[PDB]
Design a protein around this nucleic acid. Structure first.
Ligand SMILES: [K+]
Ligand SMILES: [K+]
Ligand SMILES: [K+]
Ligand SMILES: [K+]
Ligand SMILES: [K+]
Ligand SMILES: [K+]
Ligand SMILES: [K+]
Ligand SMILES: [K+]
Ligand SMILES: [K+]
Ligand SMILES: [K+]
Ligand SMILES: [K+]
Ligand SMILES: [K+]
Ligand SMILES: [K+]
Ligand SMILES: [K+]
Ligand SMILES: [K+]
Ligand SMILES: [K+]
Ligand SMILES: [K+]
Ligand SMILES: [K+]
Ligand SMILES: [K+]
Ligand SMILES: [K+]
Ligand SMILES: [K+]
Ligand SMILES: [K+]
Ligand SMILES: [K+]
Ligand SMILES: [Mg+2]
Ligand SMILES: [Mg+2]
Ligand SMILES: [Mg+2]
Ligand SMILES: [Mg+2]
Ligand SMILES: [Mg+2]
Ligand SMILES: [Mg+2]
Ligand SMILES: [Mg+2]
Ligand SMILES: [Mg+2]
Ligand SMILES: [Mg+2]
Ligand SMILES: [Mg+2]
Ligand SMILES: [Mg+2]
Ligand SMILES: [Mg+2]
Ligand SMILES: [Mg+2]
Ligand SMILES: [Mg+2]
Ligand SMILES: [Mg+2]
Ligand SMILES: [Mg+2]
Ligand SMILES: [Mg+2]
Ligand SMILES: [Mg+2]
Ligand SMILES: [Mg+2]
Ligand SMILES: [Mg+2]
Ligand SMILES: [Mg+2]
Ligand SMILES: [Mg+2]
Ligand SMILES: [Mg+2]
Ligand SMILES: [Mg+2]
Ligand SMILES: [Mg+2]
Ligand SMILES: [Mg+2]
Ligand SMILES: [Mg+2]
Ligand SMILES: [Mg+2]
Ligand SMILES: [Mg+2]
Ligand SMILES: [Mg+2]
Ligand SMILES: [Mg+2]
Ligand SMILES: [Mg+2]
Ligand SMILES: [Mg+2]
Ligand SMILES: [Mg+2]
Ligand SMILES: [Mg+2]
Ligand SMILES: [Mg+2]
Ligand SMILES: [Mg+2]
Ligand SMILES: [Mg+2]
Ligand SMILES: [Mg+2]
Ligand SMILES: [Mg+2]
Ligand SMILES: [Mg+2]
Ligand SMILES: [Mg+2]
Ligand SMILES: [Mg+2]
Ligand SMILES: [Mg+2]
Ligand SMILES: [Mg+2]
Ligand SMILES: [Mg+2]
Ligand SMILES: [Mg+2]
Ligand SMILES: [Mg+2]
Ligand SMILES: [Mg+2]
Ligand SMILES: [Mg+2]
Ligand SMILES: [Mg+2]
Ligand SMILES: [Mg+2]
Ligand SMILES: [Mg+2]
Ligand SMILES: [Mg+2]
Ligand SMILES: [Mg+2]
Ligand SMILES: [Mg+2]
Ligand SMILES: [Mg+2]
Ligand SMILES: [Mg+2]
Ligand SMILES: [Mg+2]
Ligand SMILES: [Mg+2]
Ligand SMILES: [Mg+2]
Ligand SMILES: [Mg+2]
Ligand SMILES: [Mg+2]
Ligand SMILES: [Mg+2]
Ligand SMILES: [Mg+2]
Ligand SMILES: [Mg+2]
Ligand SMILES: [Mg+2]
Lengths: 114, 118, 56, 61, 123, 209
RNA sequence: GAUGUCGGCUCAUCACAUCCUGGGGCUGAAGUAGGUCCCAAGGGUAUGGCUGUUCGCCAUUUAAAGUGGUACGCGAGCUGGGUUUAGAACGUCGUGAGACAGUUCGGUCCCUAUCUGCCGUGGGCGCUGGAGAACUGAGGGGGGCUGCUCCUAGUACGAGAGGACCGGAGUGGACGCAUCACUGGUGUUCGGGUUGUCAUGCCAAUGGCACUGCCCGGUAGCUAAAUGCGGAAGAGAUAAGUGCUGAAAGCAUCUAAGCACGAAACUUGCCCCGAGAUGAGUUCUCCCUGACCCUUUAAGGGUCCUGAAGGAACGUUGAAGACGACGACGUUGAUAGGCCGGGUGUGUAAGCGCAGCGAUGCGUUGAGCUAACCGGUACUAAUGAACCGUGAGGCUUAACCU
RNA sequence: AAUUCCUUGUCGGGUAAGUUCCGACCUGCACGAAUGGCGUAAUGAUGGCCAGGCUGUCUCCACCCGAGACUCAGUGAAAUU
RNA sequence: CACAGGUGGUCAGGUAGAGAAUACCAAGGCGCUUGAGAGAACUCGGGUGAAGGAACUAGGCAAAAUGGUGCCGUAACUUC
RNA sequence: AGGACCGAACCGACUAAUGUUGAAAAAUUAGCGGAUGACUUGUGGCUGGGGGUGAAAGGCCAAUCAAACCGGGAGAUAGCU
């Protein structure tokens, strides 16, 4: 209700960039190795966005070292330091789960030149 | 468990329910008062009142939407030419249900559902 | 599955102890016509809460 | 219970006998007769014979 | 979520191409193994000159799963296939010398640090 | 120790600076007013009765209204009792706020679990279903055997069978207290507490510790 | 004048002759690890290959993969591979019909629960004036498992190899309870794509039918694979066992008098039910303070007047629910629908304009639509009534006022 | 071996593990030449074994859509005793 | 039995389709002689399902899967 | 050309589920086999009980078959209940 909405608004980030399903984004996240906290970048196509307030999330799919990896980031998590849109993609669906069956030239996404 | 769920199956499949409520909505618009069962009337409210709210604003798009919801141009015309203008100021609740005894054939609880202004 | 012994008239009546019907507690009287009716239902003449609702 | 057990009796009775020599690891088994006692006798005979042949084989070698 | 009869790919240069989980080790009635868990595997396909041969029974550590791993903030990392690294049956140290594909931070332990060091990317 | 009666506002998450999402249940613990204090001399045991919230005057019966008026407190949506310890002492009319739990680390939350209705053995007692195919005849989710052949010749008491599941008092013990927001009258506890949103919860200092 | 059977499945329950975990004695017990016996039944006590198999062997685990009873538990719970009819064939026996604790291929598993029992859920009356709540706890049930790592400590022990007891912390497996914040499933009540066909006069736009026609997404709810929590600590009395003091029996002696320890077993401690606990308990609060007549004259019956507290009924309903029941609300109202705003999902509606020969693209445009969600809002429906429930509540004896 | 009791014979193949299967062996309890012997392409709702694909068959079940079951009105059995 | 059974011959529209298959329709005929609610277990008939993929079982039973036309190409063995 | 191939009508009936006081004294649903032939079907005829007919199962001969049904011998006989 108003109570939970207040408790969530006080935790929501205020700078989350606008990204649509199909865009290529780089998410820099905090990884901690023992005693040193550094930033690691995950760049790939946003194949799903779940808009749910503080519980908002987005899935990014990359092909790393010959293997497909998907990472579901909690948008307002303190571990996601930054999100940047490196390329705007032109899709028509909201969930590009069909890319999971496509590889190489078959998985290309046209740029939204607008 | 049906926790926090809406709608009545009414011992029908979904297509049958949709067709029945389309026909019954047309009948209520046409006659302005009909006698049905109490469950069916309490669902006809949720079918019909949104149509009148749609008719409140007259556009080609809204007329086509109303045709899709109620495939009959006489009902669309009445909604957009009389009923909408009539219920313009009313917020909601364009219908009322009056319980009217039990059906002789099956002891079914019966009711009259009518447009409020009628 | 079926009875091994015939149940009695006593047991029959005991089972039917909960089968009795319940009379209507009271009938409401319309403020305008004075006709009696089931509460929250229209009268036979078509009056509910003092207003004729169905013409006949 | 023995295999191909034909009838209520055979399905019910523990007639088949298997004898294992723990040191040797050799096994004999009999389920020819309807009687556990006769089956155990035949299996004991076979166990003695197999231990004999084991030592016979060693000596022949 | 690897169980018995699950076929996994191999992420090292040990020479196996396909292995099958025959037991999820470490518990009675333990059902599933996830990233960082040791399983007993049989080699179903191997390259001709590899160190390991088809039909060998050894151990392996699951390094990539389709079910994925869940990070403390609720995030999940999912891979497109189930992959393991074969380990010696006794020492439980990696048999190969190269690791192919990404591995996760869950693998980091004093035991599996060799894999972490030899990995192309630790996600 | 005494506890407080609150309401299940819902479930949320708290994001800590070290990248951990704590699942929390938000309990609105309004001021609980003491309507009666029971003692050894008069009642044989030491306890406080508390009320919380508000009620329609037209829905408060005269018998209940007399009790509230004797206390000198406004009517609440119910009355609950808490057994007092040896040192604990309160007075009628005193109000107790969520600040009581400020230094409490773990709490036990009791509520009425969501009601599942007439539930089968598979759902209620985690029975295993029989084979879906391979010849099973009308017995895919049925209980199976319920006893032995003649000895005992009866079904034992407490046999796990189908029946009502849920809508019963359930206590979850040793839940962390994530936050005590006194100004919003909120208690944020880690994990899931019994009951649906809008239900009453009895929150006590943890007994196991 | 019929007690259905091997194995499996589902569900078990008890015994202890204990497989693991607990406690101990002796050891041919240095430590680690064992052997053997005693106490202990709280919890726990594999998945596969082969075979109809039980059994068994084998592979790989586990702390362990216990032994048994229960019609070798359980077919009005399931199966039907084996066995057990009728078909057929092989080997063998017989001249033959046929036969085989020989084998081989195929071959109908009914029952709507009356009673007891059990799991749930109501109605009645009782509990001694009626009523609304909160309790107490006689009693009953649940639960009780365990691995690995680290510290102690490479310490004690040991020639080395190896390697502790006691005590502490962390993290798992299996099991159970709850919940849906997250990750997912579902989501024929939301959106979109698309095939065939029919219809809405036609175009455009829609609708119907084809498993929701086929699909792609997805709200609420429900839910696991998701994520919180639990097993305990402590106390009492003990088992085997260990003792102190101590005679009978100038010694000795754990015992005879007296005294102290001693386990997952017992009684508690934790969770739930629980006053039909007829031994029906306790506390708080609320309500009712009229007259008259008869009889067989009493815990008697009437007559009038009075109808309280509260309940029930009815209606709107609910994360409550088979029906009951339980909860919320009924105009002095947010109970349900509608409506309004938001959110969410889908993914840029239609119409119009432009580009293109055209399919189509672009602009208007993150557009349009949007269930169960959230915040509001009396527009619709929750009717004034009526109904049930009474009028101060027995006797005896105490104590106190009197 | 539709034949072999012993017997899950032994050896080889396949499997992590194979009383079944396949290839041999010959010690044929108790094969054998028109109650035919040994082969055999094609064929088979024929028996056994193996693999790929596929999957709620299963780990381990969850949700949804319909018809019953449940409540109300009407009609109204049965075995058994 | 106003019973999901059995019963020979004749007629043969449109669109798609090879078709008398199949889907939707025409002419024509019907909604099947108990209804109304609710939306528990369980049974029946379907839909979907994370990760796995025969571990199930006597046995892949059942389900899932494959599925058209044209072209390319196609093994042992063979009675060609 | 073909006791040829695929597949409706048509004829059949291999598997499962349902039903088992059934919608049905043998069916329904999803699949399954043949489908120019030793095919299938209408009408009529013929074969009769120790007889018929049987691509053979003791199969079929009016829901009856190791000897049909109806009537008679007949109140067969029953050391049995
Ligand atoms: K009728
Ligand atoms: K022990
Ligand atoms: K010992
Ligand atoms: K025990
Ligand atoms: K055996
Ligand atoms: K047992
Ligand atoms: K028996
Ligand atoms: K029985
Ligand atoms: K009885
Ligand atoms: K959820
Ligand atoms: K959901
Ligand atoms: K269409
Ligand atoms: K002494
Ligand atoms: K009482
Ligand atoms: K409302
Ligand atoms: K556009
Ligand atoms: K447009
Ligand atoms: K939108
Ligand atoms: K032979
Ligand atoms: K001959
Ligand atoms: K020949
Ligand atoms: K064959
Ligand atoms: K004859
Ligand atoms: Mg609702
Ligand atoms: Mg019905
Ligand atoms: Mg009754
Ligand atoms: Mg015999
Ligand atoms: Mg419920
Ligand atoms: Mg059956
Ligand atoms: Mg079934
Ligand atoms: Mg039985
Ligand atoms: Mg008898
Ligand atoms: Mg003992
Ligand atoms: Mg005991
Ligand atoms: Mg105990
Ligand atoms: Mg076994
Ligand atoms: Mg087998
Ligand atoms: Mg016995
Ligand atoms: Mg047994
Ligand atoms: Mg038995
Ligand atoms: Mg059989
Ligand atoms: Mg025969
Ligand atoms: Mg057959
Ligand atoms: Mg049965
Ligand atoms: Mg107990
Ligand atoms: Mg939610
Ligand atoms: Mg989802
Ligand atoms: Mg869907
Ligand atoms: Mg749609
Ligand atoms: Mg037209
Ligand atoms: Mg058109
Ligand atoms: Mg149509
Ligand atoms: Mg349809
Ligand atoms: Mg049609
Ligand atoms: Mg002495
Ligand atoms: Mg323990
Ligand atoms: Mg109830
Ligand atoms: Mg949106
Ligand atoms: Mg559209
Ligand atoms: Mg072999
Ligand atoms: Mg062979
Ligand atoms: Mg021969
Ligand atoms: Mg001859
Ligand atoms: Mg021959
Ligand atoms: Mg043939
Ligand atoms: Mg009835
Ligand atoms: Mg009829
Ligand atoms: Mg046609
Ligand atoms: Mg047709
Ligand atoms: Mg249903
Ligand atoms: Mg089903
Ligand atoms: Mg399906
Ligand atoms: Mg699946
Ligand atoms: Mg999948
Ligand atoms: Mg696969
Ligand atoms: Mg198997
Ligand atoms: Mg098995
Ligand atoms: Mg099949
Ligand atoms: Mg299919
Ligand atoms: Mg042919
Ligand atoms: Mg015909
Ligand atoms: Mg035939
Ligand atoms: Mg058929
Ligand atoms: Mg053919
Ligand atoms: Mg054909
Ligand atoms: Mg014969
Ligand atoms: Mg006949
Ligand atoms: Mg004769
Ligand atoms: Mg005579
Ligand atoms: Mg006679």
């Amino acid at each position: 209700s108003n109570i939970i909405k207040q408790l969530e608004q006080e935790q929501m980030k205020q700078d989350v960039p606008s990204f649509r399903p199909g865009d290529t984004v780089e998410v820099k996240v905090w990884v901690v190795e023992g005693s040193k906290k550094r930033l690691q970048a995950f760049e790939g196509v946003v194949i799903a966005i779940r808009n749910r307030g503080l519980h908002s999330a987005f899935t990014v799919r990359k092909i790393s070292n010959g293997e497909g990896v998907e990472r579901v980031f909690q948008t307002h998590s303190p571990v996601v330091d930054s999100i940047s849109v490196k390329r705007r993609g032109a899709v028509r669906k909201a969930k590009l789960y069909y890319l999971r069956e496509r590889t190489g030239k078959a998985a290309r996404i046209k740029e939204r030149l607008n | 468990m049906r926790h926090r769920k809406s709608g009545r199956q009414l011992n029908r499949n979904s297509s049958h329910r949709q067709a029945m409520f389309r026909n019954m909505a047309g009948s209520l618009v046409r006659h302005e008062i009909i006698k049905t069962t109490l469950p069916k009337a309490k669902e006809l409210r949720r079918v019909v009142e949104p149509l009148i709210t749609l008719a409140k604003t007259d556009s080609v798009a809204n007329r086509r939407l109303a045709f899709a919801r109620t495939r009959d141009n006489e009902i669309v015309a009445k909604l957009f030419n009389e009923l909408g203008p009539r219920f313009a100021s009313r917020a909601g609740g364009y219908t009322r249900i009056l319980k009217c005894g039990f059906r002789a054939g099956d002891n079914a609880p019966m009711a009259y559902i009518e447009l409020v202004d009628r | 599955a079926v009875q091994q012994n015939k149940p009695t008239r006593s047991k029959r009546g005991m089972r039917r102890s909960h089968d009795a019907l319940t009379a209507v507690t009271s009938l409401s009287v319309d403020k305008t016509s004075g006709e009696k009716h089931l509460r929250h239902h229209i009268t036979a003449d078509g009056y509910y809460r003092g207003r004729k609702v169905i013409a006949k | 219970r023995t295999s191909g057990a034909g009838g209520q009796h055979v399905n019910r009775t523990e007639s088949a006998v298997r004898i294992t020599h723990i040191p040797t690891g050799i096994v004999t088994q009999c389920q020819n007769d309807r009687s556990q006692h006769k089956n155990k006798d035949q299996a004991m005979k076979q166990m003695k014979a197999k231990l004999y042949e084991l030592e016979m084989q060693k000596k022949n070698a | 979520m690897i169980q018995e009869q699950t076929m996994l790919n191999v992420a090292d240069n040990s020479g196996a191409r396909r292995v099958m989980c025959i037991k999820v080790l470490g518990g009675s009635h333990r059902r599933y193994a996830g990233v960082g868990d040791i399983i007993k595997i049989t080699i179903k396909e191997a390259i001709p000159r590899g160190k390991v041969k088809k039909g060998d029974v050894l151990k392996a550590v699951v390094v990539r799963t389709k079910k994925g791993v869940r990070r403390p903030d609720g995030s999940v990392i999912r891979f497109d296939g189930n992959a393991c690294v074969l380990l010696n049956n006794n020492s439980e140290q990696p048999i190969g010398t190269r690791i192919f594909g990404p591995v996760t931070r869950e693998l980091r332990s004093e035991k599996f640090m060799k894999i972490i060091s030899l990995a192309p990317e630790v996600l | 120790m005494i506890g407080l009666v609150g309401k299940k506002v819902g479930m949320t998450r708290i994001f800590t600076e070290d990248g951990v999402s704590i699942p929390v249940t938000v309990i609105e613990v309004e001021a609980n007013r003491v309507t009666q204090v029971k003692d050894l001399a008069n009642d044989g045991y030491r306890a406080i009765q508390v009320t919380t919230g508000a009620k329609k005057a037209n829905r408060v019966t005269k018998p209940e209204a007399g009790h509230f008026a004797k206390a000198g407190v406004e009517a609440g949506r119910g009355l609950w009792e808490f057994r007092l310890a040896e040192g604990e002492e309160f007075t009628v009319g005193q109000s107790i706020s969520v600040e009581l739990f400020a230094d409490v680390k773990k709490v036990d939350v009791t509520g009425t679990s969501k009601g599942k209705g007439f539930a089968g053995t598979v759902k209620r007692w985690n029975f295993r279903t029989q084979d879906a195919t391979h010849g099973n005849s009308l017995s895919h989710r049925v209980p199976g055997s319920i006893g032995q052949n003649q000895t005992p010749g009866k079904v034992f008491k407490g046999k796990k069978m189908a029946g009502q599941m849920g809508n019963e008092r359930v206590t979850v013990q040793s839940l962390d207290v994530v936050r005590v927001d006194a100004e919003r009258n909120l208690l944020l506890v880690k994990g899931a507490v019994p009951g649906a949103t809008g239900s009453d919860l009895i929150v006590k200092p943890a007994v196991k510790a």
